Design a protein around this nucleic acid. Structure first.
Lengths: 153, 207, 255
RNA sequence: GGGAGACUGGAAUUCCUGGUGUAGCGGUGGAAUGCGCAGAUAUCAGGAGGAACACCGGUGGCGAAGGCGGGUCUCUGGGCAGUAACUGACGCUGAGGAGCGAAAGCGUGGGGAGCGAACAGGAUUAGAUACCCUGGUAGUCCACGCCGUAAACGGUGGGUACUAGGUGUGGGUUUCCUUCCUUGGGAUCCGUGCCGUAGCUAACGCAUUAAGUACCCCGCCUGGGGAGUACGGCCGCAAGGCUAAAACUCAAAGGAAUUGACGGGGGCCCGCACAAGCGGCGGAGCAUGUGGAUUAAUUCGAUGCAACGCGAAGAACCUUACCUGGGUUUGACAUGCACAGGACGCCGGCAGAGAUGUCGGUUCCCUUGUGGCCUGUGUGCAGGUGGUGCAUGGCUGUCGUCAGCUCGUGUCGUGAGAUGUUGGGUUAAGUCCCGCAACGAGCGCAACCCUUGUCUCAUGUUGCCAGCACGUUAUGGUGGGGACUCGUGAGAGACUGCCGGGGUCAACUCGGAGGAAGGUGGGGAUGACGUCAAGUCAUCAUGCCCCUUAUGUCCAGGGCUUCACACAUGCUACAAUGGCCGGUACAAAGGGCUGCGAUGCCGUGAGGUGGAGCGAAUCCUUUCAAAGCCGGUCUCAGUUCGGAUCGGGGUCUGCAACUCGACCCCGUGAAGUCGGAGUCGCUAGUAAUCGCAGAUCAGCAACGCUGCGGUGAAUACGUUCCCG
RNA sequence: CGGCCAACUACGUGCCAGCAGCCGCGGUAAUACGUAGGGUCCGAGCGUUGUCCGGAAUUACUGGGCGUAAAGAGCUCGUA
């Protein structure tokens, strides 16, 4: 990236939900190229959430994303031969990527005996604002606030 | 190691194989007798400059085509040299082997012959610089020769420190595939050791 | 600290001497060292004036420091290797005491690669000496509404714009209110109801435009650093907007 | 702002006093000593005291030099210009000598706000007698005196005359534009800068203010250290200053400039370099290599990148070069000079671990001169994985597939050298364009080669089967057919070709159409001058040295596999994105004759018997796979995870699986709960994950190496930091 | 008998023995060590040491310099 930005891969829409976000989620949960297993896990989690709440997977998934979507972050910036934790504004794409990554990672540490159940519980808690990803967003926003003095560079 | 052998670089494009026969079960023994023939013809003849040796094999019959700049020296007026080479070629389990002794048209546009001469002069007493100058100036006179580079390495002049020297005249694009580069390497035997001589010569390009 | 010495040939006693000489450099390294190795070799040819060759490699907290020396015997080679390694570790320190003379200092004196770039305003400097006021627009004072004033803003490509309001009959200045939307400042603050109806999302500055002189206005602009100052002139008694121009002079817009 | 004396002005710092007023202030890269809560800092008012004089204020003025600016007054020195009234050579320099002489320092008496050697703590550091922070004594200030040193420098002694100019600036006289305001301009005298001739210089540079051309006087130098030191002497309250050697030692010390290299110097750029990510290593068991230790030997080489699953693409014997022991010597193997010969050679027996020794049967064809075989006798000689990759050739790594490295003629410089190769722009590129004391060229870059992505023509077997017939389940299997693939020949197709816009209308660049592919399409082969005395006398060759009844050569056994540890590369795991069981679908590439080897049969299984068909688009490797999909079960546990280790029983190869092979069956069931400091790989069919094949190979230590395909992500805001 | 400075090869030795006026030669293949051939310069002489002059323009009267190589006193006044 020394010579400029690189092109982005235009990932395709999903067959059984028709949204970009679920395809991004299955790509995030993908491991070792087992795309079929990842799609099975994501579809099962969405169906479990639908059965539990009674509404459409996508709306509660979007609610969870908006609940865990960050807007400010902290990066190590070196100015004048000295490093500081500068709060930085997050672009929408990076916020979505971070939210999905946090959701997947925190659902991987749950104790619901199965990936599908862990993911369903995590997405439901994030929709209701109780998931650990929500806590991570709160902590990162708090850390961005605490270092606001270094926002001028 | 920097430069690969030019003959092998353009083996499939410009140059041609020096051995021509087909074998599936008998490839190994064919190779054995091929290298035996090559070493026999190299050791037997050293006065006349042996430019090249081709071997062709069809079942029993072998055709060995040997090129030299002095055919009269390697051949017998009564067939004495011919009889000697024939007898020593039968003994190599070549069954029926027949030789085609041939002469090169220009014996100074051939890189192997030029390296031969340079090594022979450098061996006894000639200063190396004189050898390269004479070889290069003699090569440029030939019509088709358009470039030449001559390089020698070793204890030049009987010194205690090894050195490498090279002189070029014209164009020698070793990276260009279509241009043909006649390449010749030979080791001169001096009382202080062995001196390596390499010669590259450029005569136009083929497509 | 533990050292492994991979000697070669006949070098009796070289291993212990090298071990004990090199292990003393652990205190010299400012960071923990890991897996520090040494190697001793001897040249077979007697024609070499310095046959013994010593090599040392240290892993100081991930940073590889290596040295190589020649000597006539094991002891001399080990001592020279120790000196070389000491010099290398001295040059490696990277702690504050060794990186304090290269950090950029002062404010304007001296320049370095990482020295803070000078903050340059958009306008040409043109210092207070002969700054002057050489741009005086009086574009429009026909009454307008908020939306009409915003459109008159947009095609003029000007961040702020001074007009006279429809409902109030008073002079007003609109400008981009940043992420909050737009902001409107009046000579006398009035609520939105008296202000003519609008559809753009804007907010009104609660403070009034104060009364002050030309030199006082320039001083306030300099000491307040705003892109412009809207005020009621003391001598004129009417509205005025001063902005630093694109040539360094002040642009005073008057009725 | 030349000097001395006296008087005096304001801002600001510090302190004190009195209001308002609270919980911090101060300080740093970050903090802590420190101050404050007994009222700090902050803000206002008043008072005291000391020092220095913002703006004017500069490469501008004065002074012999040091040096000299708040204001006013008094005393006083010098300089410049004009008139040329006056004296009439009264001039210049000056050994010694006298005087002035920055700062620091000394003495006596005052003063003491700020700063501040010394000295305390605080902080950084491995150590801080320092750099940074909080305090702080002498001193800095005044009066009278001492000292007599400075990078007291323009590193340039004083006086004079001459030698092209151009342009700033200070002071003073005058002619003409003439408003006469105006740096109008000119002329001239005295200063103070910059650029530049001639000239000088080793060069840098000086150049009317000479470091030029000459004259007068003075001071100083005779290689570097020892040494401006010792002794003696003079001065000084003291510190110390001035004058000033020798012994001894070195073969140099130096000045300018050129090419590199380097910088915790700058500028412009690149690269999975960093940043954003994904997966790892470092923790565990095992495989492999290395170090060390051990041993009779643990053969040798390789030590950052660029040694350490490397030489070794196959160590039980052989390999093998190491050790023990047993034999052998023109030798295990070549070729030449000789004497004797018809046997050499084989085949069986015996002894021996074997080498070997011995016994028993077989005996040459030429052609008379002898040749082929060997015997011994020999004699030249062989033979060395013995040493030196710092004597070498050849081969290879690396910087680095980076864009650079040079030459001819010309020009500049006394010369090393310089230009071309720099400058602006552009590129992946010393790629190209425009300029240019340079004009060109060569090796490098690119292209020409292979593969891959599209299409056309040709093409039908062992390859396809779409349309037709026969099929028997067993299917292109069979007759038949070029239609679609495919196989392999030829060709076309990407060339900024076209359009729009930026661009010096130039290179080049952005976007668009078309096309399978758009801007070196993707990946390879190709590695400039050279660097590191890089690696290899163990692929080979080789100069020199060494062994030669041995360091050569034959054999058996052992070793290279040893293990209290250390390092590195990998594999398997720690599990539910999973384990086990059943069913089921898709590849590519490659190999095969004393080899691949099928059907069938026998074993639970390695495997055994057997041999169909194949030198192979045909037969065999199964028709080929595993991940994958479906169904059942396990239910978060040191477990139905993990497989190490160990006991027993077998198969195959090989003369022989003890040291020291692989695999199969039963039992056994360790560490291991995602791994510290630190560190590695990767930008798309990539990382990750799954299987297949080949070389070496009787068998394998293969989890290694080289290829093939299946499924196939995330991220890149941007060059501040790290490496090159 | 390496170059100054006329005149080179072989053997022995190997950082030893040693050579040397200076630069510098001895690291199994030395025209520099020792010995042999060969050669050159001199010759009843040939070399070494000691002393003086020259080369030394290196005390510069003939015939040197002081910006940076050593060298302009810190600056003036002034006696001979």
């Amino acid at each position: 990236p020394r010579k400029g930005p690189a092109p982005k891969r235009p990932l395709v829409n999903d067959p059984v939900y028709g949204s970009q976000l679920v395809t991004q989620l299955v790509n995030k949960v993908l491991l070792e190229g087992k795309k079929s297993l990842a799609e099975r896990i994501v579809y099962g989690a969405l169906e479990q959430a639908r059965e539990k709440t009674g509404t459409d997977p996508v709306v509660t998934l979007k609610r969870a994303l908006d609940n865990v979507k960050p807007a400010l972050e902290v990066r190590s910036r070196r100015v004048g031969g000295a490093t500081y934790q500068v709060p930085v504004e997050v672009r929408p794409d990076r916020s979505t990527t971070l939210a999905l990554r946090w959701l997947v990672n925190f659902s991987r540490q749950r104790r619901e005996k199965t990936m599908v159940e862990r993911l369903a519980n995590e997405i439901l808690d994030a929709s209701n604002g109780l998931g650990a990803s929500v806590k991570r967003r709160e902590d990162t926003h708090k850390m961005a606030e605490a270092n606001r003095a270094f926002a001028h560079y | 190691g920097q430069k690969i052998n030019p003959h092998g670089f353009r083996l499939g494009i410009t140059t041609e194989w020096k051995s021509r026969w087909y074998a599936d079960k008998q490839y190994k023994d064919y190779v054995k007798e091929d290298v035996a023939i090559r070493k026999l013809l190299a050791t037997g003849l050293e006065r006349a400059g042996i430019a090249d040796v081709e071997i062709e094999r069809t079942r029993d019959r072998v055709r060995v085509d040997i090129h030299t700049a002095r055919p009269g020296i390697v051949i017998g007026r009564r067939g004495t040299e011919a009889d000697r080479i024939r007898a020593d070629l039968e003994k190599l389990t070549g069954k029926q082997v027949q030789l085609n002794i041939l002469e090169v048209k220009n014996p100074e546009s051939q890189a192997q012959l030029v390296a031969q001469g340079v090594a022979e002069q450098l061996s006894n007493r000639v200063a190396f610089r004189r050898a390269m100058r004479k070889a290069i100036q003699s090569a440029m006179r030939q019509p088709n020769v358009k470039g030449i580079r001559v390089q020698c390495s070793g204890r030049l002049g009987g010194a205690e420190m090894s050195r490498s020297e090279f002189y070029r005249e014209g164009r020698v694009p070793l990276h260009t595939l279509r241009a043909d580069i006649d390449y010749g390497l030979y080791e001169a035997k001096t009382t202080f050791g062995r001196i390596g001589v390499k010669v590259w010569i450029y005569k136009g390009d083929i497509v | 600290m533990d050292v492994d010495v991979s000697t070669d040939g006949e070098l009796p006693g070289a291993a212990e001497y090298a071990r004990e000489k090199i292990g003393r450099l652990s205190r010299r390294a400012h960071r923990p060292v890991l897996h520090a190795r040494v190697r001793l070799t001897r040249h077979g040819d007697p024609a070499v004036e310095r046959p013994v060759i010593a090599q040392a490699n240290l892993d100081v907290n991930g940073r590889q420091v290596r040295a190589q020396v020649e000597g006539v015997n094991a002891r001399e080679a080990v001592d020279r290797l120790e000196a070389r390694l000491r010099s290398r570790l001295e040059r490696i320190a990277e702690h504050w005491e060794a990186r304090r003379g290269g950090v950029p200092a002062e404010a304007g004196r001296e320049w370095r690669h990482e020295s803070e770039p000078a903050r340059r305003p958009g306008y040409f400097p043109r210092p207070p000496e002969e700054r002057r006021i050489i741009r005086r627009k009086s574009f429009s004072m026909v009454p307008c509404t908020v939306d009409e004033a915003a459109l008159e803003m947009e095609m003029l490509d000007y961040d702020f714009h001074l007009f006279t309001e429809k409902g109030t009959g008073f002079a007003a200045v609109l400008y981009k209110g940043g992420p909050t939307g737009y902001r409107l400042v009046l000579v006398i603050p009035v609520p939105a109801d008296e202000l003519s109806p609008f559809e753009k999302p804007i907010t009104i500055s609660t403070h009034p435009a104060p009364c002050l002189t030309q030199r006082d206005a320039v001083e306030r602009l300099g000491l307040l650093g705003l892109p412009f100052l809207f005020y009621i002139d003391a001598a004129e008694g009417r509205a005025s907007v001063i902005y630093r121009r694109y040539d360094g002079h002040y642009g005073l817009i008057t009725p």
